[PDB]
Design a protein around this ligand. Structure first.
Ligand code: HEM
Ligand SMILES: N[C@H](Cc1c[nH]c2c(Cl)cccc12)C(=O)O
Length: 343
């Protein structure tokens, strides 16, 4: 999976940045959360919160790293029943400035807490310090860079003719990158206690209010998989619930993925174009048969992520949102279209 390298290196740039010199301070947050010490949590944040304004030399990297370190306090304060912007003076203007500097929402996202978060024991930021949280973060680190590579490959595949042997080849490569999502779920199912997730981790992921609206807490739901699938199969879907789902999470993904999304909203999806071409040319063409077959395997790997993921989520929530089952159904229907072309 040679394409992963560059994405992982960009993540590592943010992970290596500590512009507020906050590492040793943020590591004390788990203890304070365990003690439910709200004044203490506010006090610890005020030790490094740049209430006077952001240093002028900062770029995206520093601002994202700053949002990461302040971010864990945001989830923590809400977990104890407090709007962070209401209990921390001068916090809201800092959060809005960091949002400006990153073109991201004014709170921590999945990216901040996982790939932009250093991995070492003496550096990794966490809400709880629990081994289950460490496993949860690792599960996302397994597949994020591969997913970003997969988005790039999907956009490239879009302009590849089914009549070309490249279609089958690019589809096979895409499947290999998407396999990492399956590995993530396997890991999460093996290593994360459902009870510890539901009782101890879940409380830290509530929404907070900043700038007169609500921003969702970090979650793997924020992974730009929905952008990949928008391009792949979903862009022209008439399912209103599905459209609402994608529009909900769009703000939380990187600006480049929001632009990819907008680019393809007014186009037929890859699947639609590929099926139209297969039907136009005939299935007697060997490159058409091979292209569709390889494309079917892309849907197979998506289902091998999505179906086990539903079980993972239902197991935790038995200690799950209907959105999950509905999306699974949509994905089966998409694969069925491909199977029907080959039949
Ligand atoms: C114990 C671990 C996990 C639990 C309890 C869980 C729970 C959920 C829930 C309840 C949803 C529905 C949206 C929401 O209400 O937040 C969701 C969506 C989603 N989750 Fe997870 N999740 C877990 C692990 C993971 C992992 C490890 C990944 C991938 C690395 C992942 C990827 C996704 C994605 C991409 C969605 C959007 C819906 C979809 O594509 O099917 N989740 N998750
Ligand atoms: N809300 C679920 C579970 C979740 C909450 N927070 C999470 C992190 Cl920080 C990483 C993975 C999963 C995760 C999801 O969105 O997948």
């Amino acid at each position: 999976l040679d394409r992963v390298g560059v994405f992982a290196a960009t993540h590592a740039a943010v992970a290596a940045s500590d512009p507020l010199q906050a590492r040793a301070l943020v590591l004390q947050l788990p203890g304070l959360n365990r003690n439910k010490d709200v004044p203490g949590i506010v006090g610890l944040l005020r030790e490094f919160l740049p209430v006077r304004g952001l240093p002028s030399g900062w770029g995206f990297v520093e601002a994202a790293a700053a949002m990461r370190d302040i971010g864990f306090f945001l989830g923590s304060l809400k977990r104890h029943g407090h709007e962070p912007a209401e209990v921390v003076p001068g916090l809201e203007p800092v959060l809005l400035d960091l949002a400006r500097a990153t073109n991201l929402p004014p709170r921590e996202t999945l990216l901040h807490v996982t790939v932009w978060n250093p991995t070492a024991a003496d550096a990794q930021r966490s809400y709880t310090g629990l081994p289950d949280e460490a496993h949860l973060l690792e599960s996302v680190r397994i597949s994020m860079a591969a997913l970003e590579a997969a988005i790039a490959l999907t956009v490239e595949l879009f302009d590849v003719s089914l009549r070309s042997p490249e279609f089958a080849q690019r589809s096979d490569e895409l499947e290999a990158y998407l396999q990492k999502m399956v590995e993530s779920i396997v890991y999460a199912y093996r290593f994360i206690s459902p009870q510890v997730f539901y009782d101890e981790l879940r409380p830290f992921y509530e929404p907070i209010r900043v700038g007169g609206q609500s921003y969702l807490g970090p979650g793997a739901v924020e992974m730009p998989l929905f952008v990949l699938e928008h391009v792949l199969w979903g862009s022209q879907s008439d399912d209103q619930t599905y459209r609402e789902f994608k529009e909900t999470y769009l703000p939380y993904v990187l600006p480049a993925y929001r632009a990819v999304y907008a680019r393809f909203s007014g186009e037929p999806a890859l699947i639609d174009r590929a099926l139209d071409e297969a039907r136009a040319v005939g299935t007697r063409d060997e490159h058409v048969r091979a292209g569709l077959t390889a494309l079917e395997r892309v849907f197979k790997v998506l289902l091998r992520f999505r179906a086990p993921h539903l079980k993972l989520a239902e197991r935790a929530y038995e200690v799950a949102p209907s959105m999950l089952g509905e999306l699974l159904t949509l994905t089966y229907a998409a694969r069925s279209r491909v199977r029907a072309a080959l039949d």
